[PDB]
Design a protein around this ligand. Structure first.
Ligand SMILES: [K+]
Ligand SMILES: [K+]
Ligand SMILES: [K+]
Ligand SMILES: [K+]
Lengths: 260, 260, 259, 260
């Protein structure tokens, strides 16, 4: 066999046109998988989706999806199974991170973050239960964060709640889905260089990198490669994990402990 | 002079008329604190609140509160500060735990659990920010659970998400509130004997106890005594903790590891 | 009386200085009988006199080398002979010398494991009989954020030892539960000790700037949590690792420390 | 451009002749790496070399090694560098797990477990520092366990201490080694089907399997495939992780929570 073969997989990546989701979609496309790249409006980035279509032997398409809308989740799952004939890997990756301190955070700001990041995760997994189950080797991969499960950051207590909520959901979902052969795992990115963050300059970037033992920010494909590994047949006994990808950022006790 | 003195405290306990919340209110009442016992409908259990009033030197009262309603939270905090002249301890305890497997869980079932358990926790803390800050020794204590942060239980993936969400919220909120002198901590109860559980008979209770190294189910005052400790001046350096109270239930590797 | 400790008999290892002395002090104030253990007879008579007047319990000093199992047995016997009981043990003794991974000698690694890990195991083992006889026995381990939570270049052996204590706890809590003994751990962050005061206020303020609470902790912060865990009221709490750090381990980066 | 290419790696696997260590060595051999398998006894060394030499394009050697002995560790690293011209992956996998209840455990029983399981790990990594650093892409992978970091098991408090100690070591070692390009990670196997468990018979194995959501015990290659992933260039931003491979064993709250 080829080790870590993903060429027979059919993958859904929510929030797949940008940032971390795009890194995840890129890796699956290079591995030869069918990949559905979902977005609120896929046509805004259709050249990205077409480019992914050139990277491997699988079929790559865009799908429209509002993750917070349970009907939209159900339509997208249906579309993907009609498209590929299967859906055996789900990367529930979509999420938002607007800023609000506790003394000003409105009920609407709190609800928006919980609707997208928590309900959107639950609805995405629920919509895909039947094809995940039918596959015999189903894989659920959640994009969480260090913020919430591990760290705090003033202005992001709702974001942190939402990212920790994904893990609480996972610890039960993994049990519900295990007898059907489905694993359920989470990836917790640290500081990842995205398209947004690049247009801020080498002084702001390397400033952030100074707190990271590895000495640089991560990339979207760092997240993508772990997701790819988790989706393989070879990872079928790994479930309920929360794996941090952060260049060692959360380890140092204090600024003086960052560098030997 | 007196170690762990709480006789000068003014405490709000949400969901305080029943179960764990009643255990927390009871301990604070015995310790001589002012205690506001909050409930969806306090009059249903006014005899409980009256009895608490006899346990110590503090003023004990009922307060109506729908934690999922941000206006209700604001009204209750105003009522409590008017009543006591202060509000320096908040036990954000209210929570529900209806059952729903992932294959049947409706958007409405998911939303209700997140609204009460997560939003209710956030709104309660937010409503109390001004008096917590004014005290200089503010205390926030969250009632979470082992289910979600530690364990899973088929039928409670939404409950687990909500209980883990409380911790993600805490890890940022503790940072936001620390310079104002406020600590933010959580208690994670295991299997606690409440009224409901009592009715189900000694043989069903003894059956659950067999998985617990300590050999019995906990009581609501086990939770209350930890909350009381966390509220003391003596606990002013403890923040952001998630402390499990479970008689060692989460420790054994398997059934044969439960007893030596 | 809520949280009554006046009927307790407590052994505190490394009890004559810093965190250990903070633990001993709180138990003494609470009215418990307290035995402080150390290697130095001079530090013993001095701390014993200090603690002796704080409450209604008796205070003794005990010579102890925690890395020696025979010395541990002697200490438990000495404590039981003096108090008639031994129902709380604070396994607190530990060392923290620096050694980078590329220079760390077998002697440096072995010493840290012998004192911090083996010393913890031998202390608990020596106390098993009186802990069991009490019906309400309490074991409290002094661990650290370093190892279980954080890393710090120079302290990989120390971190290994502090994490080892928790691995030990998670099983010991189960073996001892049916005897009525709880087994818990406290993980101090940055606590103000004598060696830190000597660094001066600029150095201390610099450390405090990474801590949300805005200051370093106190030995009695550890003492008060140990006292709570020893009460009858904490009888359903076992196998916990509780961090006491003013939120130091929470911020994501320097910019996240202050709102 | 092969994703997850390991064909240029030179790998030392301590305790590599049996059980989990052999599963690790086998996966790396299949992926085309040079593999040195180490054991305390010289007995199995020639045979494992002929057997694994067959599996891929790399070379396989057997190394006699007492991990508790610093000089033996230094000799092993030298042997590997002489044979392969490099040493860029070390799997510090050797460990022992004899039983000893707290009330009978001798100084000798405690010391032996700490010497092999903890000191053996430190000395292995230390002996490999120079070639790990020279490679530019060094990888350290520790075999820990759920027992210690997560669970308790009467009779294994020394074992659990040793397995947790590896992780305390890791959280600092990962910081010290990061600027040299070396990642340091740990795998925590749950219940893996080994020879000894097979010899107990199917009823015993089935009994164990009923506590596992996945419905079966794992295999040594489950550990080996994760080790292989961690060793890739693609996992270069992952450090300080403790990843559990257990089929969901540590998730259920109680026996009734294992199956939905
Ligand atoms: K293609
Ligand atoms: K009263
Ligand atoms: K006295
Ligand atoms: K070969």
């Amino acid at each position: 066999k080829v080790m870590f073969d993903l060429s027979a997989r059919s993958v859904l990546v929510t929030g797949g046109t940008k940032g971390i989701g795009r890194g995840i979609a890129t890796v699956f496309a290079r591995a030869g998988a069918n990949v559905a790249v979902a977005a609120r409006s896929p046509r805004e980035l259709s050249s990205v989706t077409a480019e992914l279509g050139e990277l491997g032997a699988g079929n790559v398409i865009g799908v429209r999806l509002d993750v917070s809308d349970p009907g939209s989740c159900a339509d997208a799952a249906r579309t993907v199974v009609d498209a590929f004939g299967a859906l055996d890997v789900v990367c529930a990756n979509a999420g938002i991170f607007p800023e609000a301190r506790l003394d000003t955070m409105t009920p609407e700001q709190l609800s928006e973050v919980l609707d997208v990041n928590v309900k959107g995760t639950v609805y995405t997994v629920q919509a895909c239960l039947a094809p995940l189950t039918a596959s015999g080797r189903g894989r659920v991969i959640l994009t969480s964060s260090i913020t919430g499960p591990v760290t705090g950051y003033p202005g992001w207590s709702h974001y942190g709640a939402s990212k920790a909520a994904q893990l609480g959901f996972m610890r039960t979902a993994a049990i519900e889905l295990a007898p059907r052969g489905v694993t359920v795992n989470a990836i917790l990115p640290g500081n990842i260089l995205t398209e947004g963050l690049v247009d801020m300059g080498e002084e702001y970037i390397s400033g952030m990198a100074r707190s990271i033992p590895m000495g640089m920010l991560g990339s979207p494909v760092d997240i993508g490669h772990l997701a790819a590994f988790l989706a393989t047949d070879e990872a079928g006994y790994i479930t309920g994990q929360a794996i941090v990808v952060d260049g060692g950022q959360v380890l140092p006790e204090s600024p003086d402990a960052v560098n030997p």
